[PDB]
């Protein structure tokens, strides 16, 4: 179930090799985004050849030929020659398979094969054949939920610097004359000058930009506006992200946790699988858009019923309310 | 249960109904027929009965165009059908045929409101008129 | 609904007029990459369901 996925994701982070160690200047990057228009930009002609690689050509020609039909609403009629129809029974399989393709784009074949591992002994959700397979590459955890992308990066200082140098290369705009050259006093020591506040953004935008450049715009795209980035570095203790409905924060004990304490079950303890120790804490919070959906659901109950019986409304309430509570539980408090 | 084969009676009555009521009212036309629904009546109009549909052999140009396009956009019949000017089902059948053969008193009492005509340079005194 | 279907009809018509946006060489890159993946993964194709299928 999705929340259990959140748990696999947190303990998946906390079980990574030397994940929280900032000693040498290591930098962690969480990146969340959407493919923006994905369904709408699938090309039928291409989708046919892509399905011919999977199933008997007949099945492929059926599936494809189905996405080409007439959409009617009252007066209006038109043909859909391009975008995929979501409402098809089997549309799911098209979505997930095409998504597999674009995943193969994003991760790259070498790394992807490393994750799925050898087909003779495939891996589970998050784990690798060996530690050296973990340290072998910046991309560490890659989770795709329908059209949403959740990625977790581990960088040594050099790799990060390289990325920063490439983004801050042909990515100037160049524009922003006022911002770019801002004068300050080189006479003084660093600490008596422009401290480090936004410098953390650089690494982030360099990440997001690097990801985007692996997706050809005509296929799909990613908009900085809808995406979100978080970064863990010696300047930033906290690691924030959002999976499914859950807003998650992660604070290690290796950083400044000060007083160690328990709390209501809204606090998860991330336990090292190896050492059976509680190495960090994950706080849960119910995401905004979720609360918004629930509120529109209540508003749906009030508005859509002017006629309906009073016992009926209470059923509507109870259903929605357990719908929220069974799902979120701890995060609600 | 409603579904079934189309009948000359249902089809001619469909002609007349479409003629009288117009293209955009389907529920009214489905009301007259039995054992058929509105969707079925509409799609039965635009698929087959519609006089603008071309029922005849395919010329050489239409076969060239159909084959080329079908090799251009595989399996998309509703995109191709308008380009060649034929019905999707028809050009389908013809394609499989090409591969197959290839191998209260204000009124009646008192004059409602009266404007006596204005009087002008001439004598209206004398004039009066006859009864009926 | 009506607006959305309008801009929809627009986008279909513009996709036919302006041709496929994926260009060509890109599409070949996709098809090829997928091929390599399914190759290294020993994936056998899914056949058509036979008349006699116990499931």
């Amino acid at each position: 179930p999705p929340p259990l996925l959140v748990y696999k994701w947190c303990q998946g982070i906390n079980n990574l090799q030397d994940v929280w160690e900032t000693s040498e200047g290591e930098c962690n990057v969480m990146l969340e985004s959407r493919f923006e228009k994905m369904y709408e930009k699938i090309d039928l002609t291409l989708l046919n050849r892509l399905l011919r690689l999977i199933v008997d050509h007949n099945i492929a020609d059926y599936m494809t030929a189905k996405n080409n039909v007439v959409i009617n609403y009252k007066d209006m009629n038109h043909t859909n020659s391009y975008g995929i129809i979501r409402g098809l029974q089997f549309a799911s399989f098209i979505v997930q398979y095409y998504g597999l393709v674009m995943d193969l784009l994003v991760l790259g074949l070498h790394r992807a094969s490393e994750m799925a591992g050898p087909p003779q002994m495939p891996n589970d959700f998050l784990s690798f054949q060996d530690i050296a397979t973990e340290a072998a590459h910046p991309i560490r955890l890659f989770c795709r939920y329908i059209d949403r992308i959740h990625i977790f990066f581990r960088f040594t200082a050099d790799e990060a610097r390289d990325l920063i140098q490439r983004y801050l290369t042909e990515h100037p705009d160049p524009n922003n004359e006022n911002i770019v050259g801002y004068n300050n006093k080189k006479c003084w020591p660093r600490d008596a000058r422009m401290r480090l506040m936004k410098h953390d953004v650089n690494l982030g935008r360099a990440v997001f930009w690097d990801i985007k450049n692996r997706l050809p715009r005509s296929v799909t795209t990613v908009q900085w506006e809808n995406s979100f980035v978080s970064v863990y570095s010696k300047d930033n203790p906290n690691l924030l992200f959002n999976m499914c409905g859950f807003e998650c924060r992660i604070l290690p004990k290796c950083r400044t946790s000060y007083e160690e304490f328990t709390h209501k079950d809204g606090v998860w303890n991330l336990q090292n699988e190896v050492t059976k120790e509680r190495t960090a804490q994950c706080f849960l919070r119910v995401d905004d858009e979720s609360m918004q959906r629930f509120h529109n659901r209540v508003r749906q109950i009030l508005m859509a019923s002017g006629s309906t019986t009073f016992t009926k409304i209470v059923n509507k309430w109870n259903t929605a309310l357990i719908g929220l509570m069974t799902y979120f539980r701890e995060a609600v408090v | 249960i409603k579904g079934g084969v189309w009948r000359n009676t249902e089809d001619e009555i469909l002609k007349a109904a479409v003629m009288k009521y117009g293209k955009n009212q389907w529920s009214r036309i489905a009301s007259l027929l039995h054992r058929k629904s509105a969707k079925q009546c509409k799609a039965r109009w635009y698929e087959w009965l519609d006089p603008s549909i071309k029922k005849t052999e395919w010329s050489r140009e239409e076969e060239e165009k159909l084959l080329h396009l079908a090799k251009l956009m595989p399996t998309q019949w509703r995109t191709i059908a308008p380009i060649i000017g034929r019905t999707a089902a028809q050009c389908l059948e013809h394609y499989e045929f090409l591969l197959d053969k290839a191998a209260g008193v204000d009124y009646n009492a008192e004059i409602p409101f009266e404007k006596k005509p204005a009087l002008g340079f001439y004598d209206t005194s004398e004039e009066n008129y006859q009864a009926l | 609904t009506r607006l959305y279907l309008k801009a929809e009809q627009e986008r279909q018509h513009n996709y036919l007029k302006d041709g496929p946006y994926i260009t060509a060489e890109e599409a070949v890159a996709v098809y090829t990459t997928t091929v390599h993946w399914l190759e290294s993964r020993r994936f056998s194709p899914i056949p058509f369901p036979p008349l006699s299928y116990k499931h």
């Binding site: 291409l46 | 956009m73 380009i83 | 041709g19 260009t23 060509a24 599409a27 070949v28 098809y31």
Partner: peptide, 27 residues
């Protein structure tokens, strides 16, 4: 004659690009 107005009797009350060829043949 010019201002004859067609009666508004009420009903209520396509081209293709050649790039598709290059693409399809490419695939």
């Amino acid at each position: 004659q010019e201002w004859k107005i067609p009666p508004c009797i009420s009903n209520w009350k396509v081209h293709i690009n050649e790039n598709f060829a290059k693409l399809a043949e490419a695939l």
